[model samples]
Target: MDRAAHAVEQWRSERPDLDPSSMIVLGRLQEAALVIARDRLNPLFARYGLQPGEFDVLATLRRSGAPYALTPTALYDAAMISSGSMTNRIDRLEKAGWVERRANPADGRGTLVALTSAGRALIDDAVVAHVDNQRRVLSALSAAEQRQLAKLLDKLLQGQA
Candidate 1:
């Protein structure tokens, strides 16, 4: 039996008061996220010399249009990561020659994290592969189920927020 199933079973026998259904839901959700990232997403990002967060930073830049850049603050906000974590991510990408820190013309006190040509080329290629991998990853779900799953997840997050 899975962790959630076993835990729920034990809880039913030990407590027999509160409902354990939420445990199963939350446990499976957490397990699914961990397994999908570790097994599927990480391997795919690895092919492009990226960890998931690094890939996220690159993609966020690429999707920002035109000059393909953003302030460090904006980047961390977009990635929903701490400023320190974003700083380290930027440092690693800079060392990889994938990104550079530039003076933000609009704000002398701030810096922009801009993608290099090499970084742009890498992410452009990697994104295509990443999407293909994601489609395969969700192939067990019908397209309709996929949409429902996304909707449900959105609602879950919205409720928590």
Candidate 2:
């Protein structure tokens, strides 16, 4: 049996009054996210010399389209991280020559984080590999099952909102 199954069984034996059924889905969801990120996503990102968060920054800049730039505030908002954290990320990426800080023309007092050519190329390649890795990871589920899971997850997210 899986880890969740084992835990649920033990809980049933130890505390018969409680229903541990909820742990089955919630536990697996947590486990799956961690395992996938650690075992699957991280390895792929490491091959490109990137941590997951670093990759996310590059990908966000790339997806913002031509010029591939955005204000740090915009990036932090998209990332849902604190400005200081985004500043750290920008610093790291800058050190790696993956990105640069430039004065925002539209806002003289502010700066925009722009992806370098190297960053653009790296993210373009990395995104393809990331998608392929995702497909491989989800191969265990049928297309219909995957769709249903996505729909259910979307509902869960909306419920939170």
Candidate 3:
């Protein structure tokens, strides 16, 4: 039995005020999501000399494609962080030679951020490592099982999309 299963077993033997069958499913999802992400996935970013938040911006910009440019407004919109947070992150990323700031031809009053050549290459390399690490961690589930898991989780995430 897994941790969630063991906990459910204990809960039923004790008070029995709540049904733990739901916890057996949702609790495992939430806890496993938290642990694997914060513990395993985030550390992979550190190996690339970045925090998870930093990787967020890089990945966003990398996948944005083309000139790879975006202003603070568009950037934070996609990045899901405040502009204040965006400002600090941009400075750090620029200092690391990952991205650059320049005049925005499209937005007169605002500047744009562009992923640099170095940043592009770094993210390309890091993503391969990241996906490979995830595969190893998810080895408990076969490819078909992983697809099925994503299908079920899609309901909870559809609203977010």
Candidate 4:
């Protein structure tokens, strides 16, 4: 039997009275999915000489369009990182020549972090592979099922967020 089926069988033997069959199927699938994502996605970022956190910062800036930049405060909010953590990420990216800091014109006291050309190119490459990896990961599901799953997941996240 496959892993999911084996899990269901074990649960049936352990709790003959309780309805654990559904739990086995869903629980194992969720666990497997997370494991697969971490194993696959993290490597894609690493290939571009970036950690996941660094990629996130660059991607956020790239999506901002031309002159892609945001104040450190804005990046912290967008990335949902603490101020100190954001500082460390910025420092690392700056050292790599992937990003730079400039005085924020709007707020003299604040600094803006902008993606360098190198950063933009790296993110673009990483994004393509990331999408491909996601597509392959979900290939077992039909396109319609993927869309439905996304909508359902969005609803679940909305309640928590």
Order of quality (TM-score): 1, 2, 3, 4
lDDT of each: 0.94, 0.94, 0.88, 0.86
Model 4: ten consecutive residues of lowest lDDT = 20-29
Candidate with top TM-score is: 1
**Candidate 2 residue lDDT tens string, 1-161:** 99999999999999999999999999999999999999999999999999888999999999989999999999999999999999999999999999999899899789999999999999999999999999999999999999999999999889999
Give per-model CA RMSD: 1.0, 1.4, 2.4, 3.0
Worst 10 residues of 2 by lDDT: 102-111
Q: Give the TM-scores of the predictions, in the order they appear.
A: 0.96, 0.93, 0.82, 0.79
Model 4, CA-based lDDT = 0.86
lDDT of 3 by residue, 11-110 (tens): 9989588776888888898899899988889999998999787887888888889888778888788878898999998988999999999998876899
True lDDT of residue 20, candidate 4: 71
Model 3 stretches astray by more than 4 angstroms: 9-15, 159-161
User: What is the Cα-based TM-score of model 3?
Assistant: 0.82
User: Which has the better lDDT: candidate 2, or candidate 3?
Assistant: 2
Clashes of each: 0, 0, 0, 0
